[PDB]
Design an enzyme around this catalytic site. Sequence first.
Site, PDB file in Angstrom:
ATOM      1  CG  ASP A   1      -2.018  -0.871   1.282  1.00  0.00           C
ATOM      2  OD1 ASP A   1      -2.321  -1.544   0.278  1.00  0.00           O
ATOM      3  OD2 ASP A   1      -2.688  -0.905   2.325  1.00  0.00           O
TER       4      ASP A   1
ATOM      5  CE  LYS B   1      -7.146  -0.953  -0.520  1.00  0.00           C
ATOM      6  NZ  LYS B   1      -7.113  -2.180   0.280  1.00  0.00           N
TER       7      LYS B   1
ATOM      8  N   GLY C   1      -6.088  -2.802   9.705  1.00  0.00           N
ATOM      9  CA  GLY C   1      -5.762  -1.765  10.660  1.00  0.00           C
ATOM     10  C   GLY C   1      -5.492  -2.222  12.087  1.00  0.00           C
TER      11      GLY C   1
ATOM     12  NE  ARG D   1      -3.449 -23.087  10.482  1.00  0.00           N
ATOM     13  CZ  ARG D   1      -2.681 -24.176  10.391  1.00  0.00           C
ATOM     14  NH1 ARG D   1      -3.027 -25.199   9.627  1.00  0.00           N
ATOM     15  NH2 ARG D   1      -1.522 -24.234  11.027  1.00  0.00           N
TER      16      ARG D   1
ATOM     17  N   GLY E   1      -3.151  -7.864   8.119  1.00  0.00           N
ATOM     18  CA  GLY E   1      -2.555  -8.173   9.424  1.00  0.00           C
ATOM     19  C   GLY E   1      -1.068  -8.548   9.412  1.00  0.00           C
TER      20      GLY E   1
ATOM     21  N   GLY F   1       0.341  -3.423   4.294  1.00  0.00           N
ATOM     22  CA  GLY F   1      -0.157  -2.075   4.411  1.00  0.00           C
ATOM     23  C   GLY F   1       0.873  -1.000   4.647  1.00  0.00           C
ATOM     24  CB  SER F   2       0.076   2.572   5.119  1.00  0.00           C
ATOM     25  OG  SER F   2      -0.623   2.761   3.896  1.00  0.00           O
TER      26      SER F   2
END
Lengths: 268, 270, 268, 193, 192, 193
Positions: B23, B80, B152, B164, B213, B234-235
């Site tokens: 990101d 997105k 987040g 899983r 995550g 992510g960022s």
Amino acid sequence: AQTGTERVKRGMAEMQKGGVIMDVINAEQAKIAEEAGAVAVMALERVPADIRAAGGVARMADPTIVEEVMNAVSIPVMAKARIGHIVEARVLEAMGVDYIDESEVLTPADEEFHLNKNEYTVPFVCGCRDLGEATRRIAEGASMLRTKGEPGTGNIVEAVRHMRKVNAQVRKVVAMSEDELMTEAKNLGAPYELLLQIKKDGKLPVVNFAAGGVATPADAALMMQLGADGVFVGSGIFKSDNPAKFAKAIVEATTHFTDYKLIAELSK
Amino acid sequence: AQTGTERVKRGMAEMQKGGVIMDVINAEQAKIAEEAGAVAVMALERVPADIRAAGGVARMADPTIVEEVMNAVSIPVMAKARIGHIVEARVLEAMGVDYIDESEVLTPADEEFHLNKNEYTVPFVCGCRDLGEATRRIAEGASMLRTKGEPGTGNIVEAVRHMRKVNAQVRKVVAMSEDELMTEAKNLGAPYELLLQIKKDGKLPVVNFAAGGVATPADAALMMQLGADGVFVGSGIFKSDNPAKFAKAIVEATTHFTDYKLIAELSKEL
Amino acid sequence: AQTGTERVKRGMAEMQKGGVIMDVINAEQAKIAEEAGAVAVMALERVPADIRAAGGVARMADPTIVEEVMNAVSIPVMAKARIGHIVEARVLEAMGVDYIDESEVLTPADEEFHLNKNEYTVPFVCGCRDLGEATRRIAEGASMLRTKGEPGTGNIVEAVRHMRKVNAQVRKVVAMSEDELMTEAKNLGAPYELLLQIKKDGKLPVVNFAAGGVATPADAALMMQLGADGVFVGSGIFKSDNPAKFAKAIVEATTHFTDYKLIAELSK
Amino acid sequence: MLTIGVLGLQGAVREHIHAIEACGAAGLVVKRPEQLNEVDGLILPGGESTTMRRLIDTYQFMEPLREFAAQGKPMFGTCAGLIILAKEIAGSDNPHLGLLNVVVERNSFGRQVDSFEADLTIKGLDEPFTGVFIRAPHILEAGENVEVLSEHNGRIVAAKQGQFLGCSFNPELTEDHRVTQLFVEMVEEYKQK
Amino acid sequence: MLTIGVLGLQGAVREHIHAIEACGAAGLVVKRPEQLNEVDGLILPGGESTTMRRLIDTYQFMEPLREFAAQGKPMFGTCAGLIILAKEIAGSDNPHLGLLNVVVERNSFGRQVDSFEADLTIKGLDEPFTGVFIRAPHILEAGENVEVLSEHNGRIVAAKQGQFLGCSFNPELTEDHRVTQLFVEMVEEYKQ
Amino acid sequence: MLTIGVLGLQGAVREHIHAIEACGAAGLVVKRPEQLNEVDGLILPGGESTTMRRLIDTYQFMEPLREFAAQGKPMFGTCAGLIILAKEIAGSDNPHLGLLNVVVERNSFGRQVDSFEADLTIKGLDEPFTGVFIRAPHILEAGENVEVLSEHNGRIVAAKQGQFLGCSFNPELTEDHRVTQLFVEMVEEYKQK
Ligand SMILES: NC(=O)CC[C@H](N)C(=O)O
Ligand SMILES: NC(=O)CC[C@H](N)C(=O)O
Ligand SMILES: NC(=O)CC[C@H](N)C(=O)O
Ligand SMILES: [Cl-]
Ligand SMILES: [Cl-]
Ligand SMILES: [Cl-]
């Protein structure tokens, strides 16, 4: 020569018996623990309950910290991996950590499956609250157990509850009629062959330490009095006015757990 | 020549395997991602998480920002669109974005109907938590999947759960008796023909990445070890003291996900 | 030479595969069964479904009847014990019954504990409905399984349910990731080592017959098509116009379970 | 009828008591120096030599232990215990009891991941014996008054010096009591003398 | 038994392995340079050439890959791999392995929306091959030691130079294994 | 390759198919006489000899099996299979194939409770082989053309006569495939002549 055998992994726990393992966050603390007579240290980055107190994610410690601790002492060094986190466990193994705590006080990485500890070379300690849970951890490959107790309170009550529960369940399994053991196994959620071997051996096949709640010398002795094989103690040792003195008192209370005159002096 | 074929759409995803998608909010972050070995970047305006944390509505990025990212790198650029937002998606397509994430982390525009992704030329990636959901998205025209995870938070647990679950359900489908597949399909809410084809192929028909995550090199490696085709990250990378070094560490760990000595070293001072 | 080994106990059941076991109440019925190609007969005093629907207590058969049956035929003779009825089981064993069915269609003697079948020399068959139940019977020492089915109705539906369930659950265990198996064991209530051995062997460790609703040749062949290792069939055989011929047809349908032209002729 | 003590400050104490009893001696767990007066020989168990020394110091066990030795009473060290017994410890200027004329190197195989089993040929044992080496040290050299009983890949791992028995592995972790029996015989021999 | 490696740092590695095994050779995923010693030829797969270069640099693959070619072991690059193989990349002063004598322009059809399939006449193949062109480059020019195997809209899209085979499309995204089969034969050749 | 059939009317059929394939041959479950043409040799498995005779009668297998033997193809009978092969069965005037020149007494050891395992020495095998005797018969006598491969407490338990192999135990109940290997070798040698 063969490494990583069941007897070797459990043997290391057997050699820890009657001792105190202390949570440490740096090499200075680790030295105090060794000099106080600790049998191992648990290297932590930060105290996990605090990270989660602040709502954050508690993960494996920065390997830098674990190394600093390893190089500061000559006693075994343990560290924590999140439940189910295969790579955190493999990383600690690769680093030569002596015992991995697949720990509920870190943030679980897998909420449905624990590690297949059988496939590792390094041994694991796991938490339990009753004999069913104990035997499931052992079947997955745990080589050592501890009470879950109640982290971050200093209230010995949950360690007491879990030690007493496991111990009571074992006494009943040992004494009970063998043809009643499948129903017991089913009720406990315990692997049947393990339960049968418990009855035959007259004991749990692995060492079981007290953890979560030992705040005083009386507490440490209490846990040994209730059948613990040893004691894990947290970072509060180092919050004390005299960490060295407090650490030593815990070690001595744990060793001479029926010496009440001594324990009285240690409690001051 | 034919554009927009299922094979071409999915083929792009196949070419992303083993890689990390990062990101990024500007051109400089894009360049850093590309230099770290990222296989694609996901152009964002602000981080969706803290738009919604701030209670606001998370929408398609300002096309200006997307164009900025596209001009900064030579790797693919994703962006997105809100769930069900036909026009946001068609605008991203007209801009030449390489993959559209019909994303549950933006504020959904249609809470009952996802995009008919079949009707587009550009391919789409979609989130899922289980095989039924995965196969509904594929049937609607998704060419790539990812775990929903838990955006987040930095908690890898939901990404693990989803990967899983999907992987276990596929194994069961592949191994089960063919004449029990309709009951399975109905139970899962899976389109039956798609489930039948999973059994025949022995696999999901589209690639499936980990997402939402991954906070550490060990996390990245773990998702790969659990069967992810790649990782979205992510960022957080760019909140690191050394974003370049962090991003490189995630790329190496994803690539070499059983090299535990390497990962140990990669895990230091982050 | 050792008697009573697991391999010997289970080996007997392995030698029964692909055949039909018929309930009989006297020597005449037993001779008809053997002449028809039955691989074993199950000696009954009276039909338990009739006893319990009367609604009396269904017990071990008069040993006189079991002995009549044993003296009438050269094939193995099975008989029923009430669940948990240690002495009925030991008696049957002392009589030389070849396989004991620890049977839910007799009135259970112990509603909490099944027999410790491990301690016997004679082998046991037990009923099951799902994989968890199957592995619990095996852990207690069952050497053969059968579906519980639905005694006394002639409705194949429950036999089908149980065979399908067990088989499906086995396919899943065999295919599933090893580290997910403890969670599966806990959910199923299956002893862990047994389930792990299922995955390694690719199969149940003991044979598993269909029982409790096979009324027609097509039903028999059906159960074989669903993966049964053989078929138990009831006293219904003997209520037909031509028991000899009915019994034959069931044997032939079980053997030739994919020969639909043959099965069509048998269905008349 | 024999009584062998096991120093009970820390370690795999129960294991040694079990083995003593299996050979037909009485085992006594020793936690107070005065208890030394009650046994014919002493076992220093596996565990942490660090911990044992700290506790030895605190409960003033060093002199008692030296007097015990001075009386001819046999003493058996297993791993940690070997370290407590050794004359010299590589890299340390603070040795422990110092009764066995060896130089020992602690933690010489690495860490727990390196702990291993290996079959050993031990002098006075017929069949081979499984050495279980848990974060074991090695015996770098032994003096001339010391008899080498076993070596593993050309390193000394078991040794005897009159009343002193010492090894780097933990036999008490196996169900093979033959090394314990060697020690029992040593004590029986002192108990004729 | 031929063994053909696939550089497994990133991309559509598994598709190439499957194709190798469909042709009767053994496939090896190469993630460490040492593993180059275990294989008779190497496929550089589709993916991102920038990612591959970066991982190649970090894990010190470039010299071993050069050594590998120096021994005469064949190498096959598909799209990203073709790019890794090329002597020159238009607009770049930093080429990669530099072993195939072609000039390559990256991303020359546009972006993913422009990715396409087209049927190709390929030299050595009888009937047409469906080329799947995923953010494909083109081969602007090829030296006089380069055999052209295929063109599309007047552009070279498959080329051969001794031990080196290169194409701008991804044959391994199809179940038509004939282009891999050409590489298998080059590898057989080398093995004598 | 060798194709060895197993008669699949009833019994421990797959155990035999598994052993055949363990020895590197291909197995065929035989349910129809016409399938005998597709195989180089036949195993008659363990099970109920009465069930198999009944099915042999109904499906008109007896002459085809005799034909099969007439063509020289090896046949192997384990327990029930031995009974199917035997010339004579004690107490019966209705023998079966009757190709192996032995007299067999069915159910000789008693009932299932009497079933047992014993280590056997078998001609052509080095280490002992574990015989699993499940409601087994006993060979009362063997003719002059019958070679005895194994005995247990004086009883003939394994025998060979030209193309025919017979035993009273069930080797296919073990993971030791050496007796099946003996039969594979018989088939290989038939397949040369
Ligand atoms: N096995 C043991 O007794 C361990 C000894 C410990 N490592 C020490 O050096 O003191
Ligand atoms: N199909 C592919 O390999 C894509 C290649 C990528 N666009 C590059 O320029 O390297
Ligand atoms: N193991 C077996 O094949 C048993 C044979 C069976 N008892 C019979 O006489 O036919
Ligand atoms: Cl649990
Ligand atoms: Cl949905
Ligand atoms: Cl139950």
